[PDB]
Structure 1
């Protein structure tokens, strides 16, 4: 209707922000940013709902406007800034560090990380082309272009990004024998290393994946994003380890064993 939509209601926003139906009509529309609208998570949502630091929007703004907190080690003062997958949220509150990584149920958990891990992040290369004056370049899932890459780095691979500098510290190739995370959709927040790839002419390369318990499954390659070598993940994984328990194991562990 005659241009961009600036407002956004509750309900229209995704289920994995854990937005309660009541206590408001509207939701925070994520601002135009690196990540997409539906996949990403606003900073306000990360603060008041998850971490429980702020109560109101006021308080959130008052926290953000005094610098302190920063995504990618950069000021980032806007309220509804889209913090997406695999982002370092550096805070000065008792030297606390946070990595956004997916959970069992496809949400963003409060997963703390070490001060050494805060240095670097990862990124799935979406295209690699020549820019102006024949200079090749890559582009990650979060738009962080890197000039003068290694010729080994082709499409669908992962890059380790240094944050402090826009550089390629490492790269990992796309095949079996590597630890392989999976985002997007039904099998969102799982790990199973790849068994084998499938070509399919005319788009959509369904990859076959096999977790630690050998409960194999298939997902689409656009939502697949690797991580590291077998038994050597370059990022510290959360509780659950990208396995996904059935409802039986849930009723055994999460409402029987854990009780006092």
Structure 2
């Protein structure tokens, strides 16, 4: 339609932002950036709707323009910067670090982490390719390219990114028995261990995940994120650890506070 759009109408925004229906006609359209549009979380949404630190976009911009907020070690004074999965949002004033992880409901949960863990981040290897001059590189889920990766690092692996030098300290390989985060689809936000991987050459790789409750669910390879080994995640999991309780037991737990 003659060019790229710049507005995001309300009721067209991603549902996991949990934006009010009647606050306005428009939602914050995420700027171009690391992760995505629908799979992202703008800094304005994170600061005004999740933390309630700001009351409107004007206060969000006032907070940003004094270099307080910081995404993956960089200031990111952009109001609609597309913060996404595994991104570390550190506030130096009121020093606290958040890791953008999905709760089991598929929303970006408010997840406090320590400084020693905000030092790094995890990135799913989107591709492995030889660059110019024959220099191999890996492309991660958040748009990072890291030169000279370990030759055993393949697609669907996970790499730990130093986030200060932007280098790979360690890497987890995709195979059965590894802890995985689900980053899309129906099972978004669930955590389990890889059981099996169906190939379907030419189609879409499928992977079966078994959570701690022995519940098994299938999902595409595009939305599984290796986050460590069974019972030992490389990142701190959110409050619920992605267990996917049914509505009945959720109501039981809610009523368990009498």
TM-score range for the pair, normalised by the shorter chain length: over 0.9
Distance (whole Å) between structure 2 residues aligned to residue 167 and residue 73 of structure 1: 13
Aligned-residue offset at 1:94: 2.3
Aligned-residue offset at 1:133: 0.7
Structure 1 residue runs of 4 or more that deviate by more than 6 Å after TM superposition: none
Figure out how many residues of one structure are paired with residues of the other and give that number: 258
2:59 corresponds to 1:97: no
Aligned-residue offset at 1:182: 1.0
Give CA-to-partner distance per residue, 1:112-135, whole Å, 9 cap, x none: 001100110000111101000111
Distance (whole Å) between structure 1 residues aligned to residue 173 and residue 115 of structure 2: 27
Aligned-residue offset at 1:230: 1.6
Aligned-residue offset at 1:109: 1.2
Secondary structure at 1:197 match in 2: strand
Secondary structure at 1:244 match in 2: coil
Give CA-to-partner distance per residue, 1:57-113, whole Å, 9 cap, x none: 111100000001110111211110000000000111221111100001100111100
Distance (whole Å) between structure 2 residues aligned to residue 176 and residue 55 of structure 1: 46
Give CA-to-partner distance per residue, 1:199-227, whole Å, 9 cap, x none: 11112011011111111110000011110
Q: Which residue does 1:176 correspond to in 2? A: 176
* Alpha-carbon RMSD: 0.9
Q: Which residue does 2:249 correspond to in 1? A: 249
Distance (whole Å) between structure 1 residues aligned to residue 157 and residue 114 of structure 2: 25
Structure 1: tracts of 5 or more residues without a match: none
Secondary structure at 1:222 match in 2: helix
Distance (whole Å) between structure 2 residues aligned to residue 230 and residue 26 of structure 1: 42
Secondary structure at 1:16 match in 2: helix
Distance (whole Å) between structure 1 residues aligned to residue 154 and residue 205 of structure 2: 16
TM-score by length of 1: 0.97
* Higher strand proportion: 2
